[PDB]
Amino acid sequence: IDEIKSRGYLLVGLSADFPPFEFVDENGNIVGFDVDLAKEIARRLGVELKIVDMTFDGLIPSLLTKKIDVIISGMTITEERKKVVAFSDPYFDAGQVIVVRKDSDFRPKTYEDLVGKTVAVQIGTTGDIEVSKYDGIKVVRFDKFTDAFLELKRGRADAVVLDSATARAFVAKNPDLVISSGVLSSEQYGIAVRKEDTDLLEFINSVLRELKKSPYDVLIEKWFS
Amino acid sequence: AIDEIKSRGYLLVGLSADFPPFEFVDENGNIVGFDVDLAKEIARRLGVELKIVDMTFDGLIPSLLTKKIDVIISGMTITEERKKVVAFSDPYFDAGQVIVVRKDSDFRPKTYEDLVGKTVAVQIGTTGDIEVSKYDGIKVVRFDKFTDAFLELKRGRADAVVLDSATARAFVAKNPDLVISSGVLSSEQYGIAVRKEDTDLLEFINSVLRELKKSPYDVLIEKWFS
Ligand SMILES: NC(=[NH2+])NCCC[C@H](N)C(=O)O
Ligand SMILES: NC(=[NH2+])NCCC[C@H](N)C(=O)O
Structure with missing residues (x-):
């Protein structure tokens, strides 16, 4: 987390062939639901977003080699993948x-x-x-x-x-x-991080739960929690 | 109303500050709470100042009817009896x-x-x-x-x-x-009370509520699954 702030950006890996999550628009830009999520997390960390587009099957390995900070790429949470990476809260059902x-x-x-x-x-x-x-x-x-x-x-x-x-x-x-x-x-998408980055994951889950809170829910929390 | 509230530059909200945590008096003498915050959101979205009027709970309806205030936000239950004389927003709390x-x-x-x-x-x-x-x-x-x-x-x-x-x-x-x-x-539900004739204000209040109950996540879903 501190390291991400030193560097001044969050490096997100995805494969942009998965609309509406990640994909190439008419002008050549990477956009989608996951791109928006990624921008949110970056902004909330006070850093810029840097996207690298790669082969989907190469995402985990390059997470594991520190070539990226996080995976946001319509990735299904699975017991198998849990052997090697950690997942955030689920954020979608497909x-x-x-x-x-x-x-x-x-x-x-x-x-x-x-x-x-x-x-x-x-x-x-x-x-x-x-x-x-x-x-x-x-x-x-x-x-x-x-x-x-x-x-x-x-x-x-x-x-x-x-x-x-x-x-x-x-x-x-x-x-x-x-x-x-x-x-x-019955699959659910999660955001993947290295198992050792436990602060990053906490922060990401916290951005995820805030997103699902209307300003009403937040107001209830203020006065009843 | 609306145009008239905008012209005066302040929303007049009636409540009774003896009802934590919707409205009450804190350590430093201020009136605060869930309802006060909600009142602030209404004011801001109208582009006006907020003026809280503390008074006897039972005085609020008379006070709204005599136009000393624009609205009641005071943990007030929506009832058929009160609907004879005032109008309520959509409900915003269950108790x-x-x-x-x-x-x-x-x-x-x-x-x-x-x-x-x-x-x-x-x-x-x-x-x-x-x-x-x-x-x-x-x-x-x-x-x-x-x-x-x-x-x-x-x-x-x-x-x-x-x-x-x-x-x-x-x-x-x-x-x-x-x-x-x-x-x-x-089994009771709280609403914002407003004068029956002020239907523009009632309509607006309802669409502030509707929208306070809307999550960035849901907005994002609408954005990419339109
Ligand atoms: N190109 C992509 N972004 N593919 C991701 C979806 C594939 C599937 N949900 C998985 O986790 O294996
Ligand atoms: N001091 C107050 N703000 N009281 C309001 C709560 C009273 C009750 N809900 C009612 O509508 O009759």
Whole structure:
């Protein structure tokens, strides 16, 4: 925390291929729900925000090597990831969906409906992790969701598997695609920090709980707590 | 109203400062509390100064009707009876009556019925007063200010005080010779009171409230999921 203030910025790592959380706008800028969160934390620390955009699967390792301060990148909290990083309070709820081409009679509803099919995923995601559990699925793994979608649009893969909110945003810009399934999991997004940075995490959870407090709730707290 | 409040340069808010923690007098002689803060937000959002008028609780409605004040923000319960003569904002707090007694007696009433044959102190014109007055066998003694209602209990001249849960807690908190002996005996909601004709002021107040109840998180969600 003191070190972040010396440096004069909070260094946040994300992969900007995940609207509406992180993504590239028409002018070339990284924007989204997570970008806003990150600005808030920075401002509340009295420092500037510095964003680095990288491969999603590389986020944890570069947190662990001190190349970034924190991960804000639509990252699902998982028992597995908890082995190596710490998570803030949850800040969003989503789950996996299956995206396919519109001009197709293909409409899978379950993971099992993908046995025999070629499914595109972002490497290291919970999408990746679930489909990897079924041996019948030909899993095709990409760094960026941008390429997973090109692969589906051209018909070389039969589906993309990815988080519901982001699936909706990609389908809105790609009328050739449709979400064929219901939500297949219960996932929550968290902000990741190194386990040793316990002050940073406390502060971040505290920014998170304030955000969810109306000025009414804050006023109640003032007089009743 | 609005244009008229703006023209004078100050909002006149009526309250009774004997009701912690919505409004009361602190260590340094100032009137403070949840309601005072809320009053400040209304004033600021109108672009005017804030003027608190302390007075007898039961005097507030007359005072609003004779135009000595623009609004009441004073822990006032929204009731059908009061709606005959004034208008209320949307509710902004939930509370109900409780019974407060002396810790070193042996009397622990749980319902209003338990107050039958006892001497009960209330603030005149409050929903507390209104409720105990329904019971023929309750001996009711009425006071302008809550502080005197409590002085009557602490002196052994009354067996109980009846008042709103939250304020009851705040009083007992600094009067360890007292205790709340009942659960919550009614279901009440506080509103801001304003003259029926001042519908522009009522509309505005409601949209300050609506908005004080809105979280940055929710705003952010609307921003990215429109
Ligand atoms: N490009 C991204 N920001 N992807 C993040 C979402 C992936 C999924 N929620 C996970 O934690 O694995
Ligand atoms: N001193 C006060 N501000 N009293 C207001 C509370 C009285 C009760 N809620 C009522 O509306 O009748």
